[PDB]
Design a protein around this motif. Structure first.
Motif, PDB file in Angstrom:
ATOM      1  N   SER A 276       0.919  -1.111   0.128  1.00  0.00           N
ATOM      2  CA  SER A 276      -0.004   0.074  -0.047  1.00  0.00           C
ATOM      3  C   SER A 276       0.818   1.214  -0.014  1.00  0.00           C
ATOM      4  N   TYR A 277       2.071   1.207   0.533  1.00  0.00           N
ATOM      5  CA  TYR A 277       2.973   2.297   0.598  1.00  0.00           C
ATOM      6  C   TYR A 277       4.241   2.347  -0.246  1.00  0.00           C
ATOM      7  N   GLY A 278       3.944   1.600  -1.336  1.00  0.00           N
ATOM      8  CA  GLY A 278       5.045   1.393  -2.382  1.00  0.00           C
ATOM      9  C   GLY A 278       5.999   0.519  -2.435  1.00  0.00           C
ATOM     10  N   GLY A 279       5.887  -0.716  -1.723  1.00  0.00           N
ATOM     11  CA  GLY A 279       6.701  -1.803  -1.802  1.00  0.00           C
ATOM     12  C   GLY A 279       8.082  -1.276  -1.355  1.00  0.00           C
ATOM     13  N   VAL A 280       9.060  -2.015  -2.129  1.00  0.00           N
ATOM     14  CA  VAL A 280      10.696  -1.882  -1.783  1.00  0.00           C
ATOM     15  C   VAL A 280      10.718  -0.745  -2.777  1.00  0.00           C
ATOM     16  N   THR A 281      10.745   0.607  -2.162  1.00  0.00           N
ATOM     17  CA  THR A 281      11.157   1.740  -2.834  1.00  0.00           C
ATOM     18  C   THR A 281      12.573   1.768  -3.043  1.00  0.00           C
ATOM     19  N   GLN A 282      13.338   1.035  -2.280  1.00  0.00           N
ATOM     20  CA  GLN A 282      14.902   1.111  -2.738  1.00  0.00           C
ATOM     21  C   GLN A 282      15.568   0.108  -2.042  1.00  0.00           C
ATOM     22  N   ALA A 283      16.269  -0.607  -2.799  1.00  0.00           N
ATOM     23  CA  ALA A 283      17.158  -1.835  -2.087  1.00  0.00           C
ATOM     24  C   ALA A 283      18.532  -1.733  -2.737  1.00  0.00           C
ATOM     25  N   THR A 284      19.621  -1.885  -1.823  1.00  0.00           N
ATOM     26  CA  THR A 284      21.072  -1.505  -2.211  1.00  0.00           C
ATOM     27  C   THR A 284      21.961  -2.305  -1.318  1.00  0.00           C
ATOM     28  N   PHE A 285      22.520  -3.081  -2.293  1.00  0.00           N
ATOM     29  CA  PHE A 285      23.757  -4.086  -1.860  1.00  0.00           C
ATOM     30  C   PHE A 285      24.935  -2.942  -1.312  1.00  0.00           C
ATOM     31  N   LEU A 286      25.203  -3.436  -0.024  1.00  0.00           N
ATOM     32  CA  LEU A 286      26.645  -2.674   0.470  1.00  0.00           C
ATOM     33  C   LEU A 286      27.794  -3.139  -0.346  1.00  0.00           C
ATOM     34  N   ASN A 287      28.559  -2.200  -0.627  1.00  0.00           N
ATOM     35  CA  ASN A 287      29.665  -2.449  -1.749  1.00  0.00           C
ATOM     36  C   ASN A 287      30.775  -3.561  -0.972  1.00  0.00           C
ATOM     37  N   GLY A 288      30.567  -4.781  -1.545  1.00  0.00           N
ATOM     38  CA  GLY A 288      31.582  -5.452  -1.238  1.00  0.00           C
ATOM     39  C   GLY A 288      31.342  -6.475  -0.015  1.00  0.00           C
ATOM     40  N   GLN A 289      29.829  -6.487   0.239  1.00  0.00           N
ATOM     41  CA  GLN A 289      29.733  -7.340   1.460  1.00  0.00           C
ATOM     42  C   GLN A 289      28.081  -8.002   1.209  1.00  0.00           C
ATOM     43  N   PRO A 290      27.784  -9.169   1.683  1.00  0.00           N
ATOM     44  CA  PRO A 290      26.448  -9.822   1.588  1.00  0.00           C
ATOM     45  C   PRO A 290      25.389  -9.055   2.320  1.00  0.00           C
ATOM     46  N   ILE A 291      25.446  -7.783   2.857  1.00  0.00           N
ATOM     47  CA  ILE A 291      24.387  -7.196   3.441  1.00  0.00           C
ATOM     48  C   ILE A 291      23.813  -6.312   2.262  1.00  0.00           C
ATOM     49  N   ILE A 292      22.379  -6.258   2.292  1.00  0.00           N
ATOM     50  CA  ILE A 292      21.440  -5.608   1.524  1.00  0.00           C
ATOM     51  C   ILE A 292      20.758  -4.930   2.278  1.00  0.00           C
ATOM     52  N   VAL A 293      20.534  -3.423   2.102  1.00  0.00           N
ATOM     53  CA  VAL A 293      19.650  -2.768   2.940  1.00  0.00           C
ATOM     54  C   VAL A 293      18.394  -2.102   2.261  1.00  0.00           C
ATOM     55  N   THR A 294      17.199  -2.227   2.636  1.00  0.00           N
ATOM     56  CA  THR A 294      16.087  -2.143   2.027  1.00  0.00           C
ATOM     57  C   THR A 294      14.950  -1.190   2.662  1.00  0.00           C
ATOM     58  N   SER A 295      14.416  -0.598   1.852  1.00  0.00           N
ATOM     59  CA  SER A 295      13.482   0.722   2.491  1.00  0.00           C
ATOM     60  C   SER A 295      12.222   0.472   1.830  1.00  0.00           C
ATOM     61  N   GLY A 296      11.072   1.217   2.582  1.00  0.00           N
ATOM     62  CA  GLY A 296       9.782   1.532   1.729  1.00  0.00           C
ATOM     63  C   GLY A 296       9.163   2.509   2.238  1.00  0.00           C
ATOM     64  N   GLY A 297       7.990   2.802   2.164  1.00  0.00           N
ATOM     65  CA  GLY A 297       7.131   4.115   2.332  1.00  0.00           C
ATOM     66  C   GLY A 297       6.465   3.790   3.828  1.00  0.00           C
ATOM     67  N   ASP A 298       6.647   2.401   4.333  1.00  0.00           N
ATOM     68  CA  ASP A 298       5.663   2.094   5.469  1.00  0.00           C
ATOM     69  C   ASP A 298       6.633   2.460   6.715  1.00  0.00           C
ATOM     70  N   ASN A 299       7.578   3.308   6.438  1.00  0.00           N
ATOM     71  CA  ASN A 299       8.245   3.977   7.820  1.00  0.00           C
ATOM     72  C   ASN A 299       8.989   2.913   8.498  1.00  0.00           C
ATOM     73  N   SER A 300       9.944   2.136   7.663  1.00  0.00           N
ATOM     74  CA  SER A 300      10.843   1.164   8.179  1.00  0.00           C
ATOM     75  C   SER A 300      12.164   0.931   7.395  1.00  0.00           C
ATOM     76  N   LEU A 301      13.054   0.512   7.744  1.00  0.00           N
ATOM     77  CA  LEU A 301      14.283   0.278   6.987  1.00  0.00           C
ATOM     78  C   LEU A 301      14.909  -0.983   7.485  1.00  0.00           C
TER      79      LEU A 301
END
Ligand SMILES: [Mg+2]
Lengths: 640, 158, 333, 422, 27, 49
Positions: A276-301
């Motif tokens: 309802s709030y736009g789903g995965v507005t942004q998803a970025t792999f951290l440079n050179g590590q297996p961690i991916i940071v995801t965000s959305g319009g639902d006020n969460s990261l």
RNA sequence: CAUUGGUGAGCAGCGAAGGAUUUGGUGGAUUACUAGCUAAUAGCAAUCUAUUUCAAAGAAUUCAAACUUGGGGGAAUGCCUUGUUGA
């Protein structure tokens, strides 16, 4: 619109508003810049601790965010600002009324795209200057050249070329000479995203019909085509940890991963963010590590991590699924009720229309936590009656908290919409309690109160009955029946002797809680909407239906002050801790401070959004208010 | 083969030694300025050192066939046929949801000996040893009582 | 942390001592832990005695001797606030120094204080044994390096090798060269056979905390978080002077052989692995081994030291080393 | 993490360094032919001598083994120590060893493979390093004594944790536990990669396919209740079936048929998947035994379809392929045999396919309908199409005869279709 | 025993990244 | 560049056969054998005792 | 007759696509949120180390330095202090 007693401090409870965050690297560490309305926050990728916030609120909402080392560029309306450590260092003002849409910074060039398909290029005054300031030239893409600009990107190893991506096709602009080097072939589907790949000359393009294109700029030819039927791409990102993985975010709230080498799907993360709030507005792999940071319009990261493969050999095929690592969040919809948990400015409870109740920390955002709703097993042993599908409790209409007995048993009561009982919570454990209080008259809960000793809980029903329970054992002790209409307020003095109630019928009853007797009854002209009781001075104010705040002294049972001036209903109000002021909000979009000794309005504000709740800190240093819009809490410092 | 050519690159001349990072590009110590074409080519080689070239970019390109089964798996994510279209219910899983009780509006004082739905209208009939015939309007959310009929000394067995 | 590390003479065992009092003895190749003590005290340094069976730990005020499994065997009441520990293997003598400025030799075999000498120069800042002659070198706050033997109440030799406190001392295997760093940001390479100063690196970017010399002759320097190595520095030629950078590629100038940076860590102590091409580094967060080709002796002599010793060879080796123990008074320049 | 945990990791990495005599005794004592006491006394030259003879016997059975005489079983391999080799050299070594385990996978019943393999166990320590490959190749001999010897001398990976109890145990691992090992999803990806290598190398044999199929079939059985876990199995095991169908070996194809059928009955699937599934089955269908099994699979897959279009005609490309691999006479024989399984839905879809795309076979439709009894709705669909044919196609003696056939059987229903259509 | 699925602690590692500053040049 | 390090063949130094005696490498460098004169004297004193 | 002793066999009652007991692992909190490294008035973050060296400054007769010992009695040979012999 400027108060003489109060001033904005910051907004609590927002992590992201939905604008795509920007990741920046200092040395080895990384930081995330997230937009919150008119200001941005910088979190540490390692711990998701807040580090910096913008010093001043921008005049207009931020649209794009880009970060390069220390400096952060924030775009709003027709101006692009440059910030360092959350303090503005320079402001870039474009010469056209068209609002900036996208922002790209490579080398000494800063590129700004306006909504009118005009690209502005700035350059550094000196080659060693930290950030571009000077106005180099202007490049405009016409409809014949291409459609609306989707995003600006700069591939590695390109001297003074800007890869302009439009809905129709991709274009290559040489900023130094301002000439169109190359034009892509027209694509059938509308492009929605662009991400440079770690490989050379290849930029990943995402269409509106679930196609990911590995377009090769040097050859001007397609290399690969992933297909995601019945989906819309919202983000793309590549894993640079030596494994050829691609994370494809979608507006539906899903995140899919593809292994390009093996042409296979590793896994799918479903419903990480609300659709309802736009789903995965942004998803970025951290440079050179297996961690991916995801965000959305639902006020969460959130952050997810790929664990190492569990097979000693052939670690490529046996890929562990992504694992939840850490996150920060807030309410998805504006808070409905608030309250100060402790005597200091220590913790703040917030309940919202998203059916979630949160405990927010004023002093460190990391300390903020959600109060879990997992229930205790019944003492009787009978099975709890509830739907097997787990659903959050309805919205919290009223709340009362005490700390005389924190850690010994339940210390919070909450009332729910269209619910015939009030639930208990324990602040120390941060979880729902084991007691449920029923009105016992088939009536909805309209008011909840607690005794200072923390032993009793008072529930006010919509049918006019007041039921008194014991918090330690949740056993009913006494029931008072005077009002015939809904009881809209209950309070008990500090001495646990005199009890006062108010109801829509307009009567205010005075009770002796020890002897269970009716000391007296007072009738007011209009229905009473809310009550605030000040225990130190034994004065309580009543928000009457006729747009008045009537102050009454419980000791003598007489009206002592009456306050007039509000042009509409009084949403909420509170006493100052010293007992000298009352601050009230109304639907006419104002907050007024009333000086009780003189009984007049000394300060007034005009808020853009109606203030649904107003609460003083017990110290008196801070005033917190919530608004009909905005997922956070507005905090005001008391200049007095 | 490059689809496009940029003439600006051939003319431009950059110094390497000014900044620390570029110094590693030098092929010999004597050189200090190189034209653009060589400068780009050095950058590309250095870029590969940061990100090694994976297999998928170079060796592989998309540009009765046996691999139809593999392709259809890739496109489809939900591999179960939607049960909405199918008229025939699943064997072992039942999709059942509870609603509000019919008797909640007006409770019965004896066992519900018999039940019956009206052939067309949305009414439900209950009878028991309470000797009453209670009819309810089964709407699934309220279930109010349309009427009742007490039959003195006539236990309702069916 | 921080952690001080000392390898066994044959390189088979490792001893790490945390500052907060975490002492662990382990066989690092096979990942076997022999003993691990959690003394809630301030440990400063530890060393292995005749073999890995026994080790000594310099605690807050007394030195303690421990068994292979971690059981205490003695509390050395005579040694007070020892900060540096060294073991003369052939003599079976344990050596200590600390804030008392007293150099005490203790015979492990007999358990008698062989001799206690008064340094008269305040707290001891550095200590290193010369393996060739077993003459102990102590640095002091006044910047002098004194050479001591159990049989002399006064130093054999005094060398002025710094204009401030001497933080560290290191001596080559041959006992021919000595490297001293001081708080004046200066490193000096000495010729201790003839007592002639060869090189003086007067200015360093920062003071050098530690120095170490490997079997092959590599010279190691640590400056806070940096670790730098030089090859062929210990030579009488002028061109061999340690230099951080070559000016226009001057062949004569000696640039570092290897470098490494522990980003957030202040290096505590440096120890070369005896018979491997590795350099051990202790720091705040733990121990790390850096690969240093050419660091260690390739050709060990099994009669003296054997990395592949079995237990039966060890117990036989223990007795015969004890039988021909050199008397303490034999120590001379 | 504690110091002990980190040292444990260090211990694992140096498992085969042979630092001291005691470590050498444990590493060198591991054996497949000799007990511990005799094993320790042996020398590398002695072990190589027996293996060199053993490999020669294997080469006589299969010439491919002779290549390893150049690489792994050379006289120079005696002096080759894995620990002192660099990372690039080890990978090259592992590729050779992995290839050998594939050839030896089928000959474990012969004694020489036990002597040929002993050289790799002692020299290259495959039982510690390449433990995953060794277990996978010998997975299907789990009831044999040789597998017991392997379990004794081998340290189990995390994925093979279920077999831990049967290490140094009198009983061999039971068939039930073998299902549990396959039940783990990570193991299935691991096995799928191994099985993929066998298909690439044509190294498969009947015993492997039989055992692989059963565990795959049994896994679906164990997850039949759990629909969600079944959904996770579909990407993996169907993808395996696609690979198996690609093998020119007929035995591999039959296994794909066995695997595919159980999913369709275990889990209803989209008609798009079923249609694609046939095309792979028919694309590489050459062996007669595969052709028999395939046709049984084709009818079974349609029987599971239970949605609109259950009996709709085959697509044009699919129909032509099916006719080429299965002539009309072949199916008339298929319908002839009394023990034919229920296939009416396919015959209906096939029957409607004939009318749309072939006019010459219209006589064949009459023959087919007599042989097999179709269900009421299926008959109605056929009549509906043939009514359209009469208006478009010219009225033919065969065409009217098909109507006349319906006149004889259930005359009333023929009117109902005519009433609805015309 | 079934397969043990432990979540091992994951800590960051320094990784080199291309700097776009070298991309720009001036005539 | 050209990188080479000390590399020990464990088989050379730990014999594979349990019965075989362990190899004993010898280096006669005086630097590895300090106190030549003192050690011989004590062995002389021990022999006299 | 009583068990507030154990082990079981079953009801009443509670009761929405199940309920209960134990447990491994990681994540966020448990002090009040101004970012990483270095040779730090700036560079780096792809590091340079082919300017990193010179210059200047910098050496208390404190030339003092166990505030640090379980008690009693001694101490050949040691070590400290004082004197003394002869160079
Ligand atoms: Mg737990």
């Amino acid at each position: 619109k400027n108060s003489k007693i109060f001033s904005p401090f910051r907004i609590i409870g927002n992590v992201s508003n939905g604008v795509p965050f920007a990741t920046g690297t200092l040395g080895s560490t990384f930081y995330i810049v997230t937009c919150v309305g008119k200001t941005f926050q910088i979190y540490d990728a390692n711990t998701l601790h807040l580090l910096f916030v913008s010093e001043k609120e921008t005049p207009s909402s931020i649209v794009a965010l880009s970060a390069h080392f220390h400096y952060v560029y924030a775009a709003y309306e027709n101006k692009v600002g440059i910030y360092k450590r959350g303090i503005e260092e320079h402001l870039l003002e474009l010469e056209t009324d068209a609002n900036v849409e996208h922002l790209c910074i490579f080398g000494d060039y800063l590129c700004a795209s306006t909504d009118d398909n005009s690209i502005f290029i700035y350059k550094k005054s000196d080659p060693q200057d930290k950030y571009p300031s000077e106005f180099y030239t202007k490049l405009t893409v016409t409809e014949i050249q291409g459609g609306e600009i989707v995003s600006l990107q700069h591939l590695a190893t390109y001297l003074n070329k800007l890869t302009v991506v439009t809905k129709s096709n991709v274009l290559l602009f040489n900023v130094r000479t301002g000439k169109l080097v190359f034009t892509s072939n027209e694509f059938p589907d509308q492009i929605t995203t662009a991400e440079p790949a770690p490989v050379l000359d290849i930029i990943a393009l995402g269409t509106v019909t679930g196609e990911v294109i590995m377009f090769n700029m040097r050859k001007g030819k397609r290399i690969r085509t992933i297909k995601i039927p019945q989906s819309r791409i919202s983000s793309l990102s590549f894993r640079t940890d030596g494994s050829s993985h691609l994370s494809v975010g979608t507006s539906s709230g899903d995140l899919i991963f593809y292994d390009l080498d093996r042409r296979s799907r590793i896994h799918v993360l479903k419903n990480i963010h609300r659709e309802s709030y736009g789903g995965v507005t942004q998803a970025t792999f951290l440079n050179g590590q297996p961690i991916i940071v995801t965000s959305g319009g639902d006020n969460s990261l959130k952050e997810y991590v790929f664990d190492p493969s569990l097979s000693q050999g052939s670690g490529d095929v046996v890929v562990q699924p992504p694992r939840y690592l850490r996150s920060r969040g807030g309410h998805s919809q504006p808070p409905s009720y608030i309250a100060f948990a402790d005597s200091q400015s220590h913790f703040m409870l917030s309940a919202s229309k998203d059916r979630s109740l949160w405990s927010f920390s004023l002093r460190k955002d990391a300390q903020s936590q959600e109060m879990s709703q997992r229930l205790h097993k019944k003492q009787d042993g009978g099975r709890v009656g509830g739907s097997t599908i787990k659903s959050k409790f309805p919205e919290i209409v009223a709340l009362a908290i005490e700390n005389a007995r924190i850690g010994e048993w339940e210390n919070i009561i909450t009332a729910h919409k269209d619910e015939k009982f009030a639930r208990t919570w324990d602040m120390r454990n941060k979880r729902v309690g084991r007691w449920t209080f029923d009105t016992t008259d088939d009536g909805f809960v309209k008011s909840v109160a607690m005794s200072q000793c923390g032993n009793f809980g008072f529930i006010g029903s919509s049918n006019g009955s007041i039921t008194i329970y014991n918090m330690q054992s949740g056993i009913l002790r006494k029931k008072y029946k005077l009002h015939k209409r809904a009881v809209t307020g209950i309070s008990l003095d500090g001495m646990n002797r005199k009890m006062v109630s108010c109801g829509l019928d307009g009567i205010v009853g005075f009770y002796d809680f020890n002897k269970s007797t009716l000391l007296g009854k007072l009738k007011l002209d209009a229905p009473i909407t809310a009550m605030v009781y000040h225990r130190s001075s034994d004065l309580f104010a009543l928000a009457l239906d006729d747009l008045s705040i009537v102050v009454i002294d419980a000791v003598t049972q007489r009206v002592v002050r009456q306050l007039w001036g509000h042009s509409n209903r009084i949403t909420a109000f509170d006493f100052s801790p010293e007992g000298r002021w009352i601050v009230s909000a109304s639907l006419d979009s104002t907050i007024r401070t009333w000086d009780l000794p003189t009984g007049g309005c000394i300060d007034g504000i005009i808020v853009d959004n109606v203030a649904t709740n107003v609460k003083f800190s017990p110290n008196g240093d801070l005033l917190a208010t919530t608004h009909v819009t905005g997922n956070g809490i507005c905090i005001w410092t008391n200049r007095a | 083969e490059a689809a496009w050519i940029d003439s600006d690159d051939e003319k431009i001349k950059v110094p390497i030694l000014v900044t620390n990072k570029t110094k590693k590009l030098r092929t010999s110590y004597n050189e200090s300025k190189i034209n653009g074409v060589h400068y780009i080519n050095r950058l590309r080689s250095q870029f590969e050192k940061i990100y090694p070239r994976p297999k998928w970019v170079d060796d592989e390109s998309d540009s009765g066939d046996i691999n139809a089964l593999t392709k259809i798996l890739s496109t489809t994510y939900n591999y179960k046929d939607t049960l909405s279209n199918s008229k025939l219910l699943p064997p072992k899983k039942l999709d059942i949801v509870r609603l509000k009780d019919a008797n909640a509006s007006h409770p019965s004082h004896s066992a519900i000996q018999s039940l019956s739905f009206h052939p067309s209208k949305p009414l439900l009939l209950t009878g028991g040893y309470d000797k009453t015939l209670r009819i309810y309007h089964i709407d699934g959310k309220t279930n109010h009582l349309v009427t009742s009929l007490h039959l003195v000394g006539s236990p309702i067995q069916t | 942390g921080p952690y001080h590390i000392k390898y066994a003479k044959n390189g088979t065992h490792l001893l790490i001592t945390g500052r907060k009092g975490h002492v662990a003895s382990m066989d690092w190749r096979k990942g076997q832990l022999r003993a691990e003590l959690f003394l809630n005290e301030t440990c400063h340094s530890a060393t292995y005695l005749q073999n890995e069976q026994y080790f000594a730990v310099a605690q807050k005020k007394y030195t303690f001797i421990y068994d292979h499994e971690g059981t205490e065997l003695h509390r050395l009441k005579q040694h007070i606030e020892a900060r540096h520990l060294d073991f003369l293997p052939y003599h079976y003598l344990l050596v200590t120094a600390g804030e008392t400025g007293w150099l005490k030799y203790h015979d492990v075999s007999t358990g008698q204080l062989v001799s206690e000498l008064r340094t008269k120069a305040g707290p001891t800042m550095a200590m290193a044994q010369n393996p060739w002659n077993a003459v102990m070198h102590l640095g002091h706050s006044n910047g002098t390096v004194s050479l001591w033997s159990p049989s002399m109440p006064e130093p054999l030799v005094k060398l002025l090798s710094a204009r401030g406190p001497v933080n560290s001392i290191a001596i080559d295997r041959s006992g021919y060269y000595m490297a001293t760093t001081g708080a004046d940001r200066s490193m000096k390479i000495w010729d201790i056979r003839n007592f002639k100063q060869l090189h003086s690196v007067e200015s360093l970017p920062t003071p050098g905390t530690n120095v170490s010399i490997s079997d092959t002759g590599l010279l190691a320097l640590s400056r806070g978080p940096h670790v730098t190595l030089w090859k062929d520095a210990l030579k009488l030629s002028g061109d061999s002077k340690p230099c951080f950078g070559s000016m226009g590629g001057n062949p004569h100038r000696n640039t570092p052989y290897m470098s490494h940076l522990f980003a957030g860590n202040k290096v505590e102590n440096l120890g070369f692995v005896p018979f491997e091409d590795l350099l051990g580094v202790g720091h705040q967060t733990g121990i790390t081994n850096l690969i240093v080709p050419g660091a260690g002796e390739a050709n060990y002599d099994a009669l003296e030291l054997n990395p592949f010793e079995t237990k039966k060879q060890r117990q036989e080796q223990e007795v015969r080393t004890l039988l021909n123990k050199l008397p303490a008074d034999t120590i001379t320049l | 993490s504690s110091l002990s945990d980190q040292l444990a990791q260090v211990a694992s990495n140096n498992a085969t360094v042979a630092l001291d005599r005691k470590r050498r005794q444990k590493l060198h004592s591991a054996s497949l032919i000799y007990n511990s006491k005799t094993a320790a006394t042996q020398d590398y030259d002695f072990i190589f001598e027996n293996a060199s003879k053993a490999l020669e016997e294997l080469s006589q059975i299969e010439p491919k083994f002779a290549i390893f005489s150049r690489t792994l079983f050379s006289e120079s391999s005696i002096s080759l120590d894995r620990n002192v080799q660099t990372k690039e050299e080890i990978k090259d070594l592992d590729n050779a060893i992995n290839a050998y385990l594939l050839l030896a996978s089928s000959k474990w019943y012969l004694a020489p493979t036990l002597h040929a393999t002993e050289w790799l166990v002692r020299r290259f320590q495959i039982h510690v390093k390449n433990t995953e490959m060794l277990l996978l190749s010998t997975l299907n001999y789990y009831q044999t004594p040789v597998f017991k010897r392997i379990l004794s001398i081998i340290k189990l990976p995390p994925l093979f944790n279920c077999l831990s109890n049967f290490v140094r145990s009198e009983k061999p691992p039971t068939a039930l536990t073998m299902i549990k090992l396959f039940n783990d999803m990570d193991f299935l990806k691991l096995y799928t990669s191994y099985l993929d290598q066998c298909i690439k190398h044509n190294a498969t044999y009947t015993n492997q396919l039989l055992f692989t199929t059963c565990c795959f079939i049994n896994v679906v059985a164990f997850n039949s209740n759990n629909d969600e876990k079944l959904n996770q199995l579909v990407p993996i095991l169907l993808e395996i079936s696609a690979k198996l169908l690609a093998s020119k070996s007929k035995d591999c194809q039959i296994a794909a048929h066995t695997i595919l059928v159980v999913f369709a009955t275990a889990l209803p699937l989209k008609k798009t998947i079923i249609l694609a599934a046939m095309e792979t089955i028919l694309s590489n269908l050459d062996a007669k035994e595969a052709k028999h099994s395939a046709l049984l699979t084709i009818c079974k897959l349609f029987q599971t379809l239970k949605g609109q279009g259950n009996v709709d005609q085959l697509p044009s490309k699919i129909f032509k392929l099916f006719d080429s691999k299965f002539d009309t006479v072949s199916i008339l024989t298929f319908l002839d045999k009394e023990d034919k399984p229920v296939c009416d839905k396919f015959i209906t879809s096939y029957t409607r396919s004939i009318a749309r795309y072939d006019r010459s076979k219209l006589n064949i439709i009459l023959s087919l309908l007599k042989k097999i009894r179709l269900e009421r709705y299926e008959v109605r669909l056929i009549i509906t199409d043939l009514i359209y044919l009469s208006e478009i196609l010219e009225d033919k003696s065969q065409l009217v005869e098909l109507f006349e056939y319906f006149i004889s059987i259930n005359e009333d229903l023929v009117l109902k279709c005519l009433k609805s259509l015309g | 025993p079934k397969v043990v699925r432990e979540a091992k602690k994951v800590e960051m590692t320094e990784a080199r990244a291309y700097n776009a500053d070298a991309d720009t040049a001036k005539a | 560049m050209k990188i080479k390090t000390i590399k020990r063949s464990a088989d050379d130094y730990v014999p594979v056969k349990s019965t075989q005696e362990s190899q004993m490498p010898r280096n006669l460098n005086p630097e590895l054998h300090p106190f030549e004169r003192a050690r011989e004297y004590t062995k002389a004193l021990n022999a006299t005792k």
